[PDB]
Scaffold this motif. Structure first.
Motif, PDB file in Angstrom:
ATOM      1  N   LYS A  58       0.819  -1.209   0.000  1.00 59.57           N
ATOM      2  CA  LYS A  58       0.000   0.000   0.000  1.00 59.57           C
ATOM      3  C   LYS A  58       0.854   1.261   0.000  1.00 59.57           C
ATOM      4  N   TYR A  64      -6.503  -6.745  -0.310  1.00 60.51           N
ATOM      5  CA  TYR A  64      -5.984  -6.171  -1.544  1.00 60.51           C
ATOM      6  C   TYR A  64      -7.035  -6.077  -2.641  1.00 60.51           C
ATOM      7  N   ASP A  65      -8.115  -6.855  -2.544  1.00 60.06           N
ATOM      8  CA  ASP A  65      -9.166  -6.893  -3.561  1.00 60.06           C
ATOM      9  C   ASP A  65      -8.618  -7.268  -4.932  1.00 60.06           C
ATOM     10  N   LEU A  66      -7.600  -8.120  -4.961  1.00 56.89           N
ATOM     11  CA  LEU A  66      -7.042  -8.640  -6.201  1.00 56.89           C
ATOM     12  C   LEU A  66      -7.441 -10.099  -6.351  1.00 56.89           C
ATOM     13  N   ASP A  67      -8.069 -10.425  -7.473  1.00 56.68           N
ATOM     14  CA  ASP A  67      -8.400 -11.810  -7.763  1.00 56.68           C
ATOM     15  C   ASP A  67      -7.139 -12.573  -8.155  1.00 56.68           C
ATOM     16  N   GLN A  99      -5.312 -11.624 -11.426  1.00 54.57           N
ATOM     17  CA  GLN A  99      -4.521 -10.401 -11.347  1.00 54.57           C
ATOM     18  C   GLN A  99      -3.169 -10.667 -10.700  1.00 54.57           C
ATOM     19  N   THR A 127      -4.523  -3.428 -12.279  1.00 57.18           N
ATOM     20  CA  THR A 127      -4.516  -3.913 -10.907  1.00 57.18           C
ATOM     21  C   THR A 127      -4.762  -2.835  -9.866  1.00 57.18           C
ATOM     22  N   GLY A 128      -4.251  -1.623 -10.066  1.00 56.59           N
ATOM     23  CA  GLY A 128      -4.471  -0.539  -9.136  1.00 56.59           C
ATOM     24  C   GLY A 128      -3.301  -0.201  -8.238  1.00 56.59           C
ATOM     25  N   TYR A 129      -2.247  -1.010  -8.231  1.00 58.94           N
ATOM     26  CA  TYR A 129      -1.049  -0.726  -7.455  1.00 58.94           C
ATOM     27  C   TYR A 129       0.132  -0.547  -8.396  1.00 58.94           C
TER      28      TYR A 129
END
Lengths: 718, 718
Positions: free
Chosen positions: A44, A62-65, A68, A213-215
């Protein structure tokens, strides 16, 4: 196998190191292909593209499947994982393959593979041959097949050595591949040591993936990092050892000049000093053999020595000519002495020196023969004939010859092939020089040493000499027999024979004198005179031969004389007169004043009739009138009782007197070619007459009564 | 193995390159089958069918379960991943298989496989054969088995050569497969280099899947893309090397014309110049062997040389024609001396010259005969027969023949095929020419060298002479026995016999004289004269033969003379008189005046009766009255007691006189063909009478009392 002897200790060490490196390579490759994931987790909090790593605890959402996570693992693996960590096993495999290729290139490259196979086959054949065993044992009798095999091996070894020294390819390829190995080791060690620290367990990847992914940044873990690191350390150590071995190989190949082989140990220890050092592309193979086992090179050394080949040939001759098989070839010459004649032989067998009874040895066309001291074993050897043979002597053998040599016959085309020790034989009585003493306008210096022989008695110069040498004149003071065969070359005496006063024979065959020399009148000691083919026209010099008190063997055959001089009546002591192959029409009566004739021979001459006073010479024993125009034999011819041989052939003899029974000593008579119609019936009244004693044609052989034929056939049984 | 010699360096290099490419293929295939996933992630923001890629960070929720991800991965992998990325290893495997197949096609195709196997078997057999070892050593004694094996190998090598030059198949297949390799390399490089850029890690797939997932386009990652890219680069480098090697092979095969082998270096260095160049499908194999190892070709080259075949024939002849075989094969000629006859032999065995007792040598139809110096080993040899043989002799053997040769026999059809050293034989005594010396408008130039040989005694020209050569006229002044046979060809003298002064034999058989020449009168020294088959008509020139007081053997048979002139009585020295096969009606009595006839023969003549004067020939020995119409025999004829032979065939005899019994010297008598019926009894009393001498009809033989027949037969043994 076969090529194990061609790989030194460093080569097999490199092979085993390559095998271990290949195991490392395949293990690393299987590890990478089976599982080489990089487990990445986003963080994060970001502190300059790096994770900050700053009631009860709870997990982080993390809300990553899963997919991902797989995608970020793939991207961080392909982009932010160092290429060394990913491709180490493949680089190790490639380097090991290149090391193996450069190690086996010369074994697989046909140009050098053929030469290596040829060398190893030859080395194996020469290593186990029993001839090498015998040679090393010596440091008596061998089978013919074994000797032939050894001879073939010698020949092929020599031919292969000649063929190989011009190559210089195996050494070049070996040196180049070792250089390649060394430089490859250098580069491998440098880059591997530089990049081994670049692999680690924890990595950080900022792969710029926000829309998927968002990160931004991810802390990733490489599970194989520690195993790959210890594998890389092991491979680095292996390459270090491999490079040290290759450096040792280079230092070994650069501090000896392997194009040159020493080959000195055997020739200084076994005293086989006749082994020349080999040239390039062959000294290298011998060096490799030495690195494997010096005994193979030591056993192969014998096949390059001339001493081994020479003693092999001598053993072959010993096997070929045994004592019993050689006594079969012993022959008797005219002088009735045991003669051993060698013709077109490769050398003098050592078995011929076991024949103590040997008396005459004749050598004809044998190349570069050295008479071994085993000739000292012989006792009865007296004649040695070297026709076109250059014989070299040893110290004991030369002394034995100087003590126990009697005769020597040598024929040569050039002076250079005559023995250099001929003058060292001071007991030689007779010498036969039938070469060509006419060197490059020299004063016969090549025979200037003839005066050394103080017991020289017989001379047989047949060398187309233009004039009698000074050395011959000097040595003729004690010469008994002088024979010159000039082969028709004009010879001039010019007052040179009066120096010699002890000569008994003055044979002058084919001297082309055309005149009887005036100096021969000074040699009152002469007894035998031969003047064959001297183109003599006038023989009136008999007017001066009466002073020679011992003239008994005047021979003047094969000449061109018209009339026999009356001065023959001056001589009285004539025993053998020969005037064959002449053109004489009238036979003088005064010729019969020499009542001591025994072997008078007048054959193949243009005679017409036999004088009737021949019966006045009652001491006659032989008379051959073959090929003459004698119409009829006068009766007085049969007055003599001591006649033995009477050859009347190719003559016009119409009738033969019946008084042939008067002579009991008539042994052989020849009447072939004559015009006889009937034979005397008293021909059988000769107690001593054999089948060979009568030479007549068969057609007139039966005109005599058959009783004498039956008596002759009865007496011809034995 | 065995075919390693048939693979040049480029072949083994391509084999190893194919092995490495196969390793690449299997590695890529195992990679693809084990894991070739494509991890795809949908992207929310789309910019023209492409992902836009536009407090704490949080993950992105796609609301896709794992199976939807697997489905989109499969769809993007099948539809929007380039076919090269998926099928690179399989295409590599296909190309490697094709390269291996086209490399080993000729080895596996039976039509060329059998030819290659036979060729390599023959090459291996010829490489290690000791015959090649001996041939290369020379650049003595050989075992019989080895010689037989060498001959069989020669024959099968020649047969294989005849079989192969018509093939032209192996070369065609090799060229075609090399062309295939080159074109395949070109296509592979082109398409592979073009499409290697189509493999990449990041891909975008717009696969049109809305009803199943809800997203249009997906950003996908191909984990193996970089590994496949480096593998493809490695494979492209390997294909580049393979293509360069194939280009070199094409250049090598297209700048030498491998259908033709030069074969000239060995034949110009080793003096084996008689090696014809081989044709297609056999020159190619030699070129391949040279690329592997020139030594195999060099050792196999000896079997293709005629010189090696000839010397192998000579060695097999020497091993076969042993000393004992020639010793037993010696015969006795009509001249009663040892003779050896060689008929159609390929050469003269060296064991022939080991028979020192040999005296006559006969050679017929021996091609390219070389007389070695070892003929000087022979000593009793005196006559040489060269029937249709061109003899080549070296200097020492030529000197030996110049010193120790008596007679020469040569048969020929062309001028050139006679020896050119014939005039170098100084001691020649007899010559036998049976050729055709009548050349193109020449005065017999070839035989003009007869003036060199002044020692000749017998000349036997048989060449259908038209004019007597001037050389023969000049050389006959010292000739003894001249025999000329023209086989019915006309001969003219024109004062050509007057030059001779000492000739004795003048055989003019079949010279078509048709008249007695007028130049023969001056030859008063002639003793034997024969004019057989000379078409004579009248012989009234006997008055001109009174100058010949040595003429005793006049022969005139095989002619047609009307009657015998009365001038025979003028002569008295006739001893052998012949007028056989003539047509004479009566024999004048004056012919019987010559009392010294011994061999008078008048056979096959149209005679009526014999005068009683025939009884005065008390010195006659042999008389032949065969084929004569003599009704009765004069009793005076039987009164002589010196008759030796009486041949009576085809005569008119009804009875035999009883006064034959007084004959005791009658050795033989024949009564064949006569119509006799009684044999007088007193014929059985003779000291010298056997069954061989008296041959009559079996029926007529039984008419005499048997008590003498048993006694004669008991003495017929010995």
């Amino acid at each position: 196998p076969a090529y194990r002897i061609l790989k030194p200790w460093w080569d097999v060490f490199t092979d085993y190191i390559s095998i271990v490196m290949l195991m490392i390579a395949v293990f690393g490759g299987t590890l990478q292909v089976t599982q080489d994931k990089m487990i990445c987790l986003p963080c994060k909090w970001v502190t300059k593209d790096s994770c900050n790593d700053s009631t009860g605890p709870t997990g982080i959402k993390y809300d990553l499947d899963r997919h991902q996570y797989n995608y970020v693992d793939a991207v961080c693996y392909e982009n932010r994982l160092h290429w060394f960590a990913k491709y180490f096993p493949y680089l190790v495999l490639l380097h090991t393959l290149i090391f193996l290729a450069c190690s086996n290139f010369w074994f697989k490259f046909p140009r050098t593979s053929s030469k290596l196979e040829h060398f190893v086959s030859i080395l194996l054949k020469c290593f186990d041959s029993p001839w090498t065993t015998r040679a090393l044992s010596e440091t008596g009798v061998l089978d013919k097949k074994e000797g032939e095999q050894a001879k073939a091996l010698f020949e092929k070894v020599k031919k292969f050595r000649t063929h190989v020294e011009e190559g210089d390819i195996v050494y070049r390829l070996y040196m180049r591949q070792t250089i390649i190995k060394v430089i490859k080791f250098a580069l491998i060690i440098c880059y591997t040591v530089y990049y081994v620290h670049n692999i680690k367990f924890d990595v950080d990847c900022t792969v710029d993936i926000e829309s998927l992914t968002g990160y931004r940044t991810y802390r990733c873990a490489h599970p194989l990092a520690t195993l790959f690191k210890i594998l890389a350390s092991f491979y680095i150590s292996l390459v270090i050892f491999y490079g040290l071995i290759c450096m040792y190989t280079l230092w070994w190949m650069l501090r000896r000049s392997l194009k040159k082989y020493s080959f000195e140990s055997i020739r200084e220890e076994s005293s086989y000093s006749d082994i020349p050092d080999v040239k390039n592309d062959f000294a290298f193979m011998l060096h490799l053999i030495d690195q494997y086992d010096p005994l193979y090179s030591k056993r192969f050394a014998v096949f390059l020595s001339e001493v081994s080949e020479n003693k092999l040939r001598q053993l072959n001759l010993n096997n070929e000519w045994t004592l019993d098989k050689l006594r079969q070839r012993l022959t008797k010459n005219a002088q009735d002495k045991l003669e051993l004649h060698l013709f077109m032989l490769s050398g003098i067998p050592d078995t011929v020196f076991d024949l103590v009874e040997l008396e005459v040895l004749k050598l004809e066309l044998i190349p570069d023969v050295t008479i071994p001291p085993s000739i000292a074993q012989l006792t009865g050897l007296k004649e040695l004939w070297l026709y076109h043979t250059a014989a070299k002597i040893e110290a004991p053998a030369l002394a034995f010859l100087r003590e126990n040599l009697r005769a020597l016959h040598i024929k040569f085309t050039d002076i250079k092939e005559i023995p250099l020790w001929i003058y060292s034989l001071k007991t030689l009585e007779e010498l036969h020089l039938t070469g060509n003493l006419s060197a490059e306008n020299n004063r016969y210096i090549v025979i200037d040493g003839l005066r050394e022989l103080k017991r020289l008695k017989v001379l047989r110069l047949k060398s187309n000499l233009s004039k009698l040498p000074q050395v011959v004149t000097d040595v003729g003071v004690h010469l008994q027999k002088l024979s010159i065969n000039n082969e028709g070359t004009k010879l001039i005496v010019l007052n040179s024979l009066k120096k010699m006063v002890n000569l008994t024979e003055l044979e002058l065959i084919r001297c082309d004198l055309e005149r009887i020399p005036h100096s021969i009148f000074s040699l009152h000691n002469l007894q035998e005179i031969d003047l064959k083919d001297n183109n003599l026209k006038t023989i009136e010099e008999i007017i001066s031969f009466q002073h020679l008190h011992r003239l008994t063997c005047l021979k003047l055959w094969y000449n061109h004389i018209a009339y026999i001089p009356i001065q023959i009546g001056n001589l009285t002591n004539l025993e053998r007169l020969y005037l064959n192959r002449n053109k004489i029409e009238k036979i003088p009566t005064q010729l019969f004043y020499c009542r001591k004739l025994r072997y008078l021979d007048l054959s193949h001459n243009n005679l017409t009739f036999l004088p009737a006073d021949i019966g006045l010479l009652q001491n006659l024993q032989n008379l051959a009138v073959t090929a003459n125009r004698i119409e009829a034999l006068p009766p007085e011819l049969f007055q003599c009782r001591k006649l033995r041989a009477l050859h009347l052939g190719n003559n016009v003899l119409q009738s033969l007197p019946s008084r042939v029974g008067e002579l009991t000593n008539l042994t052989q008579i020849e009447l072939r070619g004559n015009r006889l119609e009937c034979l005397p019936v008293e021909l059988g009244e000769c107690p001593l007459l054999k089948r060979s004693g009568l030479v007549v044609e068969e057609d007139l052989f039966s005109t005599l009564p058959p009783e004498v034929k039956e008596r002759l056939w009865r007496a011809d049984k034995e």
